[PDB]
């Protein structure tokens, strides 16, 4: 029926999210300006956007109940592996099926397939990413479920390099049970039909998107002219 602890967890995550995801997107003005013509014209802007987003995901992760109990090394492994996935997940909030784009408050900060494809990454990444956004949007998750999914994504014991996988697993299960119980007690059918299973599938979809993003990143890292336009944080998190 959702223990006091589980309600506690959900409250913590909702707050953590509100403190790390600003729906006014007021900080986007600090990013190097977007350029829509477009040979890699969107790379500078989106590089800053992603770098900024990485910082926000780290802020969120640190507030996840139990994350603080992990070692510095394990925290780093988890963030490095989940960053792009959580970024793709949190972005579902600005994504709109009306015109298949991420509407971040204004024309200049509204990104579609043509914009997102001007940063060195191909449709081999973008097409599946857009499909993912649609599938996730169609789940019509409660914000409670959205934040739980992001936290579950971050605290994954099977990430390469994890040391105390047992501690990680325990922390994740606590989150996974909170999710399974919230769906049962707070998400009325039919919208709840196999919802947990579908949410877990999205975690699988994100692994695939992550793998493809990594593949293309490596390729691009072989070209200094592009790597030159990224940020130090991106270079560090994604590989240098």
């Amino acid at each position: 029926k959702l223990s006091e602890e589980q309600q506690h967890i959900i409250a913590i995550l909702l707050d953590a999210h509100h403190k790390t995801y600003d729906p006014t997107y007021a900080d986007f003005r600090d990013f190097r300006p977007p350029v829509r013509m477009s040979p890699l014209s969107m790379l500078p802007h989106l590089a800053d956007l992603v770098s900024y987003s990485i910082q926000k995901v780290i802020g969120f992760a640190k507030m996840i109940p139990g994350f603080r109990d992990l070692t510095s090394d394990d925290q780093i492994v988890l963030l490095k592996s989940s960053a792009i996935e959580v970024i793709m997940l949190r972005s579902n909030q600005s994504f709109t099926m009306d015109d298949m784009s991420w509407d971040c408050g204004s024309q200049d900060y509204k990104y579609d397939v043509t914009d997102v494809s001007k940063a060195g990454h191909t449709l081999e990444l973008i097409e599946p990413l857009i499909k993912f956004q649609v599938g996730l949007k169609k789940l019509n998750l409660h914000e409670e479920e959205h934040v739980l999914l992001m936290a579950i994504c971050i605290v994954s014991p099977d990430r390469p390099g994890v040391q105390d996988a047992k501690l990680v697993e325990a922390i994740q299960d606590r989150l996974s049970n909170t999710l399974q119980t919230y769906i049962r007690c707070r998400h009325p059918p039919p919208g709840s039909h196999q919802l947990y299973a579908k949410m877990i599938q999205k975690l699988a979809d994100l692994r695939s998107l992550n793998e493809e993003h990594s593949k293309q990143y490596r390729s691009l890292s072989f070209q200094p002219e592009n790597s030159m336009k990224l940020t130090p944080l991106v270079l560090e998190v994604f590989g240098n």
Partner: peptide, 11 residues
Amino acid sequence: KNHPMLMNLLK
């Protein structure tokens, strides 16, 4: 693999 900025943001 020594992640200075990440480590700093986590602490």
